[PDB]
Write an enzyme that holds these catalytic residues in place. Structure first.
Site, mmCIF file in Angstrom:
data_model
loop_
_atom_site.group_PDB
_atom_site.id
_atom_site.type_symbol
_atom_site.label_atom_id
_atom_site.label_comp_id
_atom_site.label_asym_id
_atom_site.label_seq_id
_atom_site.Cartn_x
_atom_site.Cartn_y
_atom_site.Cartn_z
ATOM 1 N N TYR A 44 3.039 0.578 2.465
ATOM 2 C CA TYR A 44 4.368 0.357 1.948
ATOM 3 C C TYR A 44 5.475 -0.433 2.943
ATOM 4 O O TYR A 44 6.610 -0.371 3.058
ATOM 5 C CB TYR A 44 5.493 1.494 1.464
ATOM 6 N N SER A 45 4.439 -1.432 3.798
ATOM 7 C CA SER A 45 5.585 -2.079 4.870
ATOM 8 C C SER A 45 6.424 -2.962 4.736
ATOM 9 O O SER A 45 7.189 -3.013 3.847
ATOM 10 C CB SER A 45 4.377 -2.477 6.039
ATOM 11 N N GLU A 46 6.550 -4.250 5.575
ATOM 12 C CA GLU A 46 7.589 -5.150 5.533
ATOM 13 C C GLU A 46 7.089 -6.366 4.447
ATOM 14 O O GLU A 46 6.772 -7.338 4.852
ATOM 15 C CB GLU A 46 7.976 -5.832 6.863
ATOM 16 N N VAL A 47 7.160 -6.185 2.997
ATOM 17 C CA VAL A 47 7.107 -7.037 2.124
ATOM 18 C C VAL A 47 8.111 -6.961 1.058
ATOM 19 O O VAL A 47 8.563 -5.995 0.693
ATOM 20 C CB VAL A 47 5.572 -7.065 1.390
ATOM 21 N N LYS A 62 5.752 -11.660 2.793
ATOM 22 C CA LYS A 62 5.113 -10.470 3.581
ATOM 23 C C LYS A 62 5.555 -10.937 4.991
ATOM 24 O O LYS A 62 4.556 -11.792 5.886
ATOM 25 C CB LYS A 62 3.711 -10.311 3.328
ATOM 26 N N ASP A 148 -11.198 -3.413 4.762
ATOM 27 C CA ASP A 148 -10.156 -2.529 4.257
ATOM 28 C C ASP A 148 -9.960 -2.411 2.869
ATOM 29 O O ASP A 148 -8.859 -2.697 2.341
ATOM 30 C CB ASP A 148 -8.560 -3.022 4.862
#
EC number: 2.7.11.1
Length: 322
Positions: A44-47, A62, A148
């Site tokens: 749930y990172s920096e996007v 992103k 991944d």
């Protein structure tokens, strides 16, 4: 005396036969736009969801995190090399703040496979697995391992029966002989070659991961191999695939096994798939689903199905008829 080397059973040399530029990403020249073409809307990172204040177009931005400058070039190159391919996400632009790098993507109706396959029918599973395999066979054919593969990296537009394989930040080009970092995928999806530190892996890595999804999806068991660390992960696998095969695998490739494992793997039979079946998940399990699943989850990376092979399994018989 050292690990036995390995080659990819397919698309082994696709990269050798291409122009240096294609895979030599360290020397790629990126040209940046200004982010002032985009306005951030939501997060749930920096996007973020954003718009193009020049075409009123919905996009996803992103913002990358500080990471080796080559790995950016790599992700960008790989994204460009795969643009247009079946079920591969689409890079629209690359921008800096006027100074962190950000990648801008075509707007997809986000619903990762997690928040969805908890509700799928036997048919849907087959259908989306075929879609992922379309994306995996493509990039494999294009000299690339996504490394991944997992539900969080598969966006599904269930309303439109659409799917995108996303997040290519761990992806690498396959070159016969090269030894790769074993510190790649997410824990529950790391293949045995990674857990036992065997670096000469290939596209097969991805089919293990696929296998892990198919398993958790049909048996309805999220985190099908629920390890508590990169060592106990191999133990959870052993308790299912048995240890005899594990050890033959070690021997076959003359792999030096970490001193630690000596005291945890122990002895284990190869459990039959039926022991994971029950009233909740029986509608998804089938002789073919299990035949198929079994051909994915092999210690020996060379004996796993290729993506193309998988697409030609009876499990997909119904789907491919369309």
């Amino acid at each position: 005396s050292g690990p036995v080397p390995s080659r990819a059973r397919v698309y082994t040399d696709v990269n050798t036969h291409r122009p240096r530029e294609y895979w030599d990403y360290e020397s790629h020249v990126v040209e940046w736009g200004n982010q002032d073409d985009y306005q951030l809307v939501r997060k749930y990172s920096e996007v973020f969801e954003a718009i193009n204040i020049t075409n009123n177009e919905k996009v996803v931005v992103k913002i990358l995190k500080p990471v080796k400058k080559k790995k950016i070039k790599r992700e960008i190159k790989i994204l460009e090399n795969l643009r247009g391919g079946p079920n591969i996400i689409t890079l629209a632009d690359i921008v800096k703040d006027p100074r962190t790098p950000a990648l801008v993507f075509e707007h997809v109706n986000n619903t990762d496979f997690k928040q969805l396959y908890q509700t799928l029918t036997d048919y849907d599973i087959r259908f989306y697995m075929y879609e992922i395999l379309k994306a995996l066979d493509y990039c494999h054919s294009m000299g690339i391992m996504h490394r991944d593969v997992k539900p969080h990296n598969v966006m599904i537009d269930h309303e439109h029966r659409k799917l995108r394989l996303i997040d290519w930040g761990l992806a690498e080009f396959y070159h016969p002989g090269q030894e790769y970092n074993v510190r790649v995928a997410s824990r529950y999806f790391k293949g045995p070659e990674l857990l036992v530190d065997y670096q000469m892996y290939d596209y097969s890595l991805d089919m293990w991961s696929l296998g892990c999804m198919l398993a958790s999806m049909i048996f309805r068991k999220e985190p099908f191999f629920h390890g508590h660390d990169n060592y106990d992960q191999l133990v959870r696998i052993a308790k299912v695939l048995g240890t005899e095969d594990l050890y033959d695998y070690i021997d076959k490739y003359n792999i030096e096994l970490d001193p630690r494992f000596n005291d945890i793997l122990g002895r284990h039979s190869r459990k039959r798939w039926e022991r994971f079946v029950h009233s909740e998940n029986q509608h998804l399990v089938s002789p073919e689903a299990l035949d198929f699943l079994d051909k994915l989850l092999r210690y020996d990376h060379q004996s796993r199905l290729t993506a193309r092979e998988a697409m030609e399994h009876p499990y997909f018989y119904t789907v491919v008829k369309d």
